[PDB]
Amino acid sequence: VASPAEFVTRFGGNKVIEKVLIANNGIAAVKCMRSIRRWSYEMFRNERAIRFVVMVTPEDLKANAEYIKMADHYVPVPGGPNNNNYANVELILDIAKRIPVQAVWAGWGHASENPKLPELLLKNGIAFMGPPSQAMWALGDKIASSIVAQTAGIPTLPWSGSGLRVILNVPQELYEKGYVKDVDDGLQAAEEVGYPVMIKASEGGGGKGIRKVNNADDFPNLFRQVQAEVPGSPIFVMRLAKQSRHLEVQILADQYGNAISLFGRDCSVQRRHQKIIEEAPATIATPAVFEHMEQCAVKLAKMVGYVSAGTVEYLYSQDGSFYFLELNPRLQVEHPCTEMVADVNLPAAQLQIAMGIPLYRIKDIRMMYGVSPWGDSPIDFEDSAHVPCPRGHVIAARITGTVQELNFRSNKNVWGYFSVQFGHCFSWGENREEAISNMVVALKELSIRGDFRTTVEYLIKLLETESFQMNRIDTGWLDRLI
Template sequence: EGAIMVESDQINGRMSSVDEFCKALGGDSPIHSVLVANNGMAAVKFMRSIRTWALETFGNEKAILLVAMATPEDLRINAEHIRIADQFLEVPGGTNNNNYANVQLIVEIAERTRVSAVWPGWGHASENPELPDALMEKGIIFLGPPSAAMGALGDKIGSSLIAQAAGVPTLPWSGSHVKVPQETCHSIPEEIYKNACVSTTDEAVASCQVVGYPAMIKASWGGGGKGIRKVHNDDEVRALFKQVQGEVPGSPIFIMKVASQSRHLEVQLLCDKHGNVAALHSRDCSVQRRHQKIIEEGPITVAPPETIKELEQAARRLAKCVQYQGAATVEYLYSMETGEYYFLELNPRLQVEHPVTEWIAEINLPASQVVVGMGIPLYNIPEIRRFYGIEHGGGYHAWKEISAVATKFDLDKAQSVKPKGHCVAVRVTSEDPDDGFKPTSGRVEELNFKSKPNVWAYFSVK
């Protein structure tokens, strides 16, 4: 009985310090527990980051309760995210629509475990607008954007139209002539949307002639190489348009010019629910293989500082336009020849390569997602104040002192401090040269890696 009393005292102490933190920094929804709706590296990284932050902020690494989802496969290999979590719930195995991508199941578990919030990670259900809606209905915080912003940006045609409305350059495409009033940004009228699409072979040919060859015929709902064809002349359009239609039935189709030799550059954003947006430096992930990023580094070194500033400001305008909340990445194509840049897409979630930004900006991104989820404005977050070189900024350990003296500042006018240094992330992949370089795990004889404070690694091989 005595042990139980101590435990409940510990829980009460833990809760009151989180409540005090939230209130002192201007938040309105304390987060005491989080369901991690993911597995593997995403779940492990989130949990480690939250533990580190909780220890620094509250002197207790378990100040926030972490709940994991565990499939039979995860349990069999004694997966790391299950070992780190405070508690776990077993979920069905098999493909992810049975578990980590199953919105109904995630919401049921969140209700059953009475968590304050759900973290979706990347992949799985992280870009499904049904999840934030379903959680909101139950009064559970979603550590990501509202469904309207996610839906508007998750669509390739819609996001390009929104970019145009926000004054972000796009490549010549079938919707270049379409004007979107800024006030209709987060729900584009169907008539305007249709004007950006091509629905017949003749329309596709006409659009390609305006856009210029080589061009891409793309199905908006396509992905992973499906519903996309490169064309060099009218005859190819006539031959391939129907193929794109057939691969992704019912999907709207658009035409976009193929970019000449370009770099793939991106800007990390963090947004609060009060309309503040911070651009946390930039990354270059041009080295790709089979549309997968292999090397990610930051900050960008291939473009001049004034262009990087433009990329950051354009990304901020785009996020404000759709009233975005949480972490996001805006991706661009950048032409080394002309120095021009074009909007590619906005990822409405945290990305695999976010540790690059964490190191150069000295900001704990998973912790920032939780803090923003509590309703705390960016200008009160100690690490954000430090990032902009504003007085009374620093680490989370100083939150009590900072909250007593911190004053609001304008993120539109603030200049960030220089990146701490340069950081490179590498994806280690193995392929079989005897089988057309197909990805393969092969046989791992030995794996020996020691993490250091400045070098972090995650292996799915145990």
């Protein structure tokens, strides 16, 4: 194809996107540009075919943040906390309208989980490379998403909104039974479910507004803390589960009702609720149980009219039981785990979906389902469920300008980045053992650096432990290892 406009016609889309505004910074802004520009070179032999507009804070400009010079165009925005810049929906819209751009990519963090952003963009004829307003609330809000999950017949752990049920919508009166309007209704909910409990803000993102509660005397101040951490957000109470496996299903949906899973990720290796090690695929679950978890994830996405990328998170037990925990209405930082085993470029798929390209017209998806790479033949994703199989294994490891891309001479199958704080290394292998081995050697090469001496040791130690090698870990594993 000669241009984005020709691509849209040839591949059956309905919206020409030549310019995208990035409502983010750091690795997110860099990853979106790198992934899309690679796809653009493959399609148009011009990596700049889809132009990128970036938002620049005085802080990011003073730091000489790499995403600024990478961008085709940059826009200085007001400094300070993200509510004045990156997370300011009114500012994002104003810039989108002014250039103008044809789509917005929010990534992870900032305004990526604010349902007003796609709402205002749609009103102005601007696409959002993420779910529509409706689907983002009913699946992103924790109380509402658990009610949708229950409506779909997906199991959930005992919580303040247990028993509640009914394209779908959760009415405010039903929703209001699931939440704890005050500390007193909360104390009551905690007593019904039974201690130990979790007080959780439903609008909380990245582990914010969550408190572990062992007894009723501790409850009120812990409730007051959750209110203070995520102000304005409704609050719910849930049973604090036993040590389990934390699993994720990667979802991808177009604008036409087609939604698929891109296998799963195991994110059980956690330290103070922070995801430390991720793996793709999620080998711990029984193939039949994981297939069920995948179908539930697709049903749940289809029910609310979900579009773009999403993550369905589950708590899994050795019993073979699983419980819906939440839906992440955006791309995650650990998404390359999936990209590598599924051979799906996630930001490019988000772009194509926003251009109205059906899933069956995306080369990556066609290949995944074993059909012609350039054909227009519709795919029955339900009938070809056994057809996709992961290509090898990936291990992701959390490590502790603004973005330094870290290249390894020890391995061709390992890559990473360090941000300014934390970063991630990604190791592919033909199988799990082969992927852990490459990670160790890469972390050992990384160990030769000064700043990465102490930090990489505990990771090398955890990766070599018999429990990890034998995949006999759980959510409480790391926290008791120290």
